[PDB]
Amino acid sequence: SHMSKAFDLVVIGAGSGGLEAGWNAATLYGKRVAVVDVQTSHGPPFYAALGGTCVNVGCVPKKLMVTGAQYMDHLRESAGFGWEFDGSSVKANWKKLIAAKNEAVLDINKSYEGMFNDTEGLDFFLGWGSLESKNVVVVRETADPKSAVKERLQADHILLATGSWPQMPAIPGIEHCISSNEAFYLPEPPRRVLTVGGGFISVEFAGIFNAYKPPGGKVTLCYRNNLILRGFDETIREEVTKQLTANGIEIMTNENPAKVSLNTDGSKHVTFESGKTLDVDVVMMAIGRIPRTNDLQLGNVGVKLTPKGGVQVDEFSRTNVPNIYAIGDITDRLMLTPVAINEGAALVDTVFGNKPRKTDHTRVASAVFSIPPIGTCGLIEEVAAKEFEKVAVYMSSFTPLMHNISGSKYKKFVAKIVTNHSDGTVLGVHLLGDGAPEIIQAVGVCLRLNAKISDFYNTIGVHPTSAEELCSMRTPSYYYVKGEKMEKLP
Amino acid sequence: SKAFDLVVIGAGSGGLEAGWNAATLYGKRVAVVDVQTSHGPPFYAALGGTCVNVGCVPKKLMVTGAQYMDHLRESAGFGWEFDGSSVKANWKKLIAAKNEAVLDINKSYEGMFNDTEGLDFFLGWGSLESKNVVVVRETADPKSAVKERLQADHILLATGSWPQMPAIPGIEHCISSNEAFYLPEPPRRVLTVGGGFISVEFAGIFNAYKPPGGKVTLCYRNNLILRGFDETIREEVTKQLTANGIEIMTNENPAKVSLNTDGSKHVTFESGKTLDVDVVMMAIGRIPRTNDLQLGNVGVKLTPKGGVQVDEFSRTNVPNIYAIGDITDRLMLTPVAINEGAALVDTVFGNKPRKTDHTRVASAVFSIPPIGTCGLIEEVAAKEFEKVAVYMSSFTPLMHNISGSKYKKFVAKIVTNHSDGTVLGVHLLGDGAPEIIQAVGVCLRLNAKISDFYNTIGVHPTSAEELCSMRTPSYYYVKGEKMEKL
Ligand SMILES: Cc1cc2nc3c(=O)[nH]c(=O)nc-3n(C[C@H](O)[C@H](O)[C@H](O)COP(=O)(O)OP(=O)(O)OC[C@H]3O[C@@H](n4cnc5c(N)ncnc54)[C@H](O)[C@@H]3O)c2cc1C
Ligand SMILES: Cc1cc2nc3c(=O)[nH]c(=O)nc-3n(C[C@H](O)[C@H](O)[C@H](O)COP(=O)(O)OP(=O)(O)OC[C@H]3O[C@@H](n4cnc5c(N)ncnc54)[C@H](O)[C@@H]3O)c2cc1C
Ligand SMILES: NC(=O)C1=CN([C@@H]2O[C@H](COP(=O)(O)OP(=O)(O)OC[C@H]3O[C@@H](n4cnc5c(N)ncnc54)[C@H](OP(=O)(O)O)[C@@H]3O)[C@@H](O)[C@H]2O)C=CC1
Ligand SMILES: NC(=O)C1=CN([C@@H]2O[C@H](COP(=O)(O)OP(=O)(O)OC[C@H]3O[C@@H](n4cnc5c(N)ncnc54)[C@H](OP(=O)(O)O)[C@@H]3O)[C@@H](O)[C@H]2O)C=CC1
Ligand code: NA
Numbered sequence A: 001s002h003m004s005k006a007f008d009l010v011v012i013g014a015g016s017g018g019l020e021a022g023w024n025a026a027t028l029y030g031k032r033v034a035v036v037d038v039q040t041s042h043g044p045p046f047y048a049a050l051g052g053t054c055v056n057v058g059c060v061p062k063k064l065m066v067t068g069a070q071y072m073d074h075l076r077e078s079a080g081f082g083w084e085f086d087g088s089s090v091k092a093n094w095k096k097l098i099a100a101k102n103e104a105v106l107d108i109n110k111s112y113e114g115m116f117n118d119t120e121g122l123d124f125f126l127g128w129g130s131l132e133s134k135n136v137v138v139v140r141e142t143a144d145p146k147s148a149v150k151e152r153l154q155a156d157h158i159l160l161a162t163g164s165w166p167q168m169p170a171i172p173g174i175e176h177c178i179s180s181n182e183a184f185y186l187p188e189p190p191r192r193v194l195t196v197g198g199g200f201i202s203v204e205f206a207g208i209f210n211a212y213k214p215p216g217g218k219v220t221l222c223y224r225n226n227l228i229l230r231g232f233d234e235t236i237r238e239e240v241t242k243q244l245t246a247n248g249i250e251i252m253t254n255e256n257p258a259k260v261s262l263n264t265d266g267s268k269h270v271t272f273e274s275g276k277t278l279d280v281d282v283v284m285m286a287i288g289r290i291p292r293t294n295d296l297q298l299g300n301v302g303v304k305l306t307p308k309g310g311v312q313v314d315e316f317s318r319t320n321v322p323n324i325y326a327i328g329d330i331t332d333r334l335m336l337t338p339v340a341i342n343e344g345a346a347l348v349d350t351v352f353g354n355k356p357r358k359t360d361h362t363r364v365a366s367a368v369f370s371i372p373p374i375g376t377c378g379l380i381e382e383v384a385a386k387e388f389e390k391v392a393v394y395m396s397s398f399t400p401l402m403h404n405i406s407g408s409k410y411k412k413f414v415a416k417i418v419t420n421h422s423d424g425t426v427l428g429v430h431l432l433g434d435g436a437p438e439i440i441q442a443v444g445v446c447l448r449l450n451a452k453i454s455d456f457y458n459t460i461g462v463h464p465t466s467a468e469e470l471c472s473m474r475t476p477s478y479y480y481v482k483g484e485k486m487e488k489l490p
Numbered sequence B: 001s002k003a004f005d006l007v008v009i010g011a012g013s014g015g016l017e018a019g020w021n022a023a024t025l026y027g028k029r030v031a032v033v034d035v036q037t038s039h040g041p042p043f044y045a046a047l048g049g050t051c052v053n054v055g056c057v058p059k060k061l062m063v064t065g066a067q068y069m070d071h072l073r074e075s076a077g078f079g080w081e082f083d084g085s086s087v088k089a090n091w092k093k094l095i096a097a098k099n100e101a102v103l104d105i106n107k108s109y110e111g112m113f114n115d116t117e118g119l120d121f122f123l124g125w126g127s128l129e130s131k132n133v134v135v136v137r138e139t140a141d142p143k144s145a146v147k148e149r150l151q152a153d154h155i156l157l158a159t160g161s162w163p164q165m166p167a168i169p170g171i172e173h174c175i176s177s178n179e180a181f182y183l184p185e186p187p188r189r190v191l192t193v194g195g196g197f198i199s200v201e202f203a204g205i206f207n208a209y210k211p212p213g214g215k216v217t218l219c220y221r222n223n224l225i226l227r228g229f230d231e232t233i234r235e236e237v238t239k240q241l242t243a244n245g246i247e248i249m250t251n252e253n254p255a256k257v258s259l260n261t262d263g264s265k266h267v268t269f270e271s272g273k274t275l276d277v278d279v280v281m282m283a284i285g286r287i288p289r290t291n292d293l294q295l296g297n298v299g300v301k302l303t304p305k306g307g308v309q310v311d312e313f314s315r316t317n318v319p320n321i322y323a324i325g326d327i328t329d330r331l332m333l334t335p336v337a338i339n340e341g342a343a344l345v346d347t348v349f350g351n352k353p354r355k356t357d358h359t360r361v362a363s364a365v366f367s368i369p370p371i372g373t374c375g376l377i378e379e380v381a382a383k384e385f386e387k388v389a390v391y392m393s394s395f396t397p398l399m400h401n402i403s404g405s406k407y408k409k410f411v412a413k414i415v416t417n418h419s420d421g422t423v424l425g426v427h428l429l430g431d432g433a434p435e436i437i438q439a440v441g442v443c444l445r446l447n448a449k450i451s452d453f454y455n456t457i458g459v460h461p462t463s464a465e466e467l468c469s470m471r472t473p474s475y476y477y478v479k480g481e482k483m484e485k486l
């Protein structure tokens, strides 16, 4: 038919948050739900598809890629333990990796497809959603608001969950640059590659490129200021920098690309603000991601943006427009998949359940799948020290015995616990080293339960592990007193 | 003769924690006794204990070395190419690297003694001469050349345990974990005997380093290995060791062993079956090392099971004599022995009478794949709580759809008291499980409920996030009866 369809809830963007939102509303609460996305499976032209950034061009494939990359390390380090093979025969075949990543991704797409053909009151619509009015979502053939209309969807409640998009700086020859999106689809691993940025994506990808580089290859990461990974634990920022360098990656600090042009042979000639130069085969910009509001036509209903660009929301995910809600990266609070998932469930429960619920944005466990990986939950010391007269820091940082054998002496495992010293409350835990992301999950539960240093300490360690460092620390290495760092209390 | 506040017999995980704590927190004058200064035959354990010498430390390295068999094969799926026929597992190298690491620990333990005041070390064999006197002789025999007479206000028994050997003909042609640590070469065919920690861990080790053509056989006298651990996990870990080429013989138990002309061993099981192997390793339990203490001179009391009797404070029936760690038979874990030592010295020379909590202790089996657990298994919970709920997730992580090890199901189980949602037990199988479970131990000391886990935000992608995404029970035990619904 040529008639519009009517829903309790339309969700725009079928990603981490939107999927959880939709599924919950239908299966839990018996609501009729519509979900809109631009593409049924991963890749060009739109990259994100059904399943979101996570599944298609994010969490899932990067983690498979980082996992592939860790074999570089494993193969070398096995020698310490008696493994002998022909080192000269060793090749890292990127196309195989990328083909296997694509098959895995596509299965997830296909199963999502399955589910929406199956579940009562959960319908999928292919196209570009925008807001026509308070209770009408329009689905057009492209982002152009003048493209043809495929559907009009009537909605009592509209959820906005279109996520984010890579930020590209406006510099000469920016068109010779890629983002993470294109990185996932490179026909060949680059011989020379520059990853611009000192954050999650740059540091994770550098690790990937570094393992898969052809012979004579070089990965370079540039960062515009002095120390990468602002927002993370200072000891950890400095350590991951040592460790990345130790594994063959050049970290250029205080350097920022000013322009890019093509050499005669087609490679990329980068000029930094400092005037320094660098030739690479690929320049990947990873300088941030921004909420995807531009195509929603929010102007039509009057949904307000933050000064920043995200949809403004209250703690309950509600926009200034009564029945229109936003979640996930589109709000630009915390950009994480399981955060987006939690926001979706809390929204749905609130709107369609009998009992309001808000997502807790503090104490969120999270990771960097760098080589080696970070795992963190809670406040860094310098932030705690601005909010508490007395702050204790417990630090353990040592090369693990397995790594005096493996030959990777530079692989210090770091475990840091941050306390309000007045009362023992654990404010933050920061880890670096193998297993950090896994160790950290349960630490999330601890912080929720208002854990204290003595709670960890009284817990009997599992031995031999890295994790047990968290449960053998009773004496602070240092303190901050009025925001002042000191070895001892006066 | 020489006088001391505390004499510690046994320089192991527990002994050392207690002695140091006694010297350096309480300023006491401490003597610690041990039979050997570094690792290996003929007494195997030494300064550092079983842990350091012939337990936790060296086996975790060895297991780590074993894991590479999987990584090497598994890299292929992610695009790694190399010549798989060039791949040799060099055991002599593994052993020499292991020996070197353990030697450095023995060395830095000597160092520690020379650098700490009120902490003295005595080489030799410790016996209780009388309520307040510890003699050190040259050998384990009570009539050997007395080396030292230590006068003691307090005596800590910290001698640990020893491999149990069954009384069967040809038992002298078997080895234990001790000798396993020192084999000149990796066995081609080997029988690990027993269904517990050590059998399972070593099986994993021999399976990786076995020369071309080899086979590891693990045998267990009953139907399913690893009694005492979660049931789904005993089944799965079985399946997964099988998938990695380990033959698991259930309901089988050696009745005798003999020497074959080639140096290998002929094993006859009770059932009548036979098997030829290069090495039979008995891993059928560990018993409290009591026999050389001459406990009869003081009359320190044993239990039926064989270990020194203590109260919750680690005190013997004899006033100033205490026992901690494996000798007491409570929980044979290194960090349990370290905590036991700590608590005892806080009761005695502190103002703070302290007792170790043996419930909710996280621990691991370093099997390939590994296990991690804290708290009750469901069959035990159902005997103690009217309503028990079980939340379960079990499936192959996506990385192992690509590695091609499709059989590495990751298992996460949460066992609650369904009445109030209290988490009673968590059980894990899969890479990371021993790391994942450490903080889970902390949770249980904060009366975490199933909803605390679920309402925590996951870290994605991890195996661990599985613990924070289980909302609905898979099944229930009502009054002891397993049912799907209520
Ligand atoms: C390379 C990379 C790696 C990452 N790794 C991790 C990680 O390891 N762990 C982690 O926790 N987070 C990771 N993230 C972040 C994580 O992916 C996001 O926080 C999460 O995807 C946000 O979920 P969401 O629902 O808000 O949006 P998304 O998952 O992005 O879903 C948005 C969906 O909306 C669609 N869409 C956009 N506009 C329209 C339109 N108008 N009409 C219809 N559909 C539209 C898009 O196609 C997309 O599918 C990573 C991100 C990137 C880029
Ligand atoms: C192969 C193996 C692997 C293991 N792996 C782990 C693991 O990964 N994690 C874990 O938590 N636990 C593990 N364990 C168990 C763990 O080692 C014990 O629970 C722990 O060592 C207990 O320590 P203890 O202080 O009670 O005595 P020990 O650590 O065993 O030390 C006792 C010391 O007493 C000495 N001694 C004995 N008699 C005398 C005497 N008469 N005079 C002087 N000295 C004497 C011995 O030489 C020994 O060094 C493992 C055990 C084995 C056998
Ligand atoms: N495993 C995980 O959890 C992952 C999470 N993510 C999520 O996606 C978000 C975005 O990832 P990402 O793109 O790496 O962004 P981030 O915001 O994490 O980091 C961006 C980096 O670019 C630098 N930068 C910012 N602006 C500029 C500029 N104009 N010119 C030059 N450099 C600049 C920043 O420096 P400065 O400090 O000076 O601002 C910072 O070093 C992440 O914050 C995270 O929330 C992404 C990948 C993996
Ligand atoms: N990583 C860690 O934390 C480790 C800790 N350890 C510690 O050391 C202790 C001892 O290790 P282990 O040697 O494996 O002993 P365990 O008690 O762990 O396992 C013993 C196995 O031997 C079987 N068995 C018992 N008696 C006999 C018998 N008479 N004849 C034949 N078989 C028998 C038992 O079967 P049944 O169930 O039927 O009684 C059981 O399956 C462990 O329990 C653990 O506490 C050891 C290694 C690693
Ligand atoms: Na502890």
Ligand code: NA
Binding pocket: B113, B114, B115, B116, B117, B118, B119, B120
């Ligand atoms: Na000394």
Ligand code: NA
Binding pocket: B453, B454, B455, B456, B457, B458, B468, B469
């Ligand atoms: Na959760």
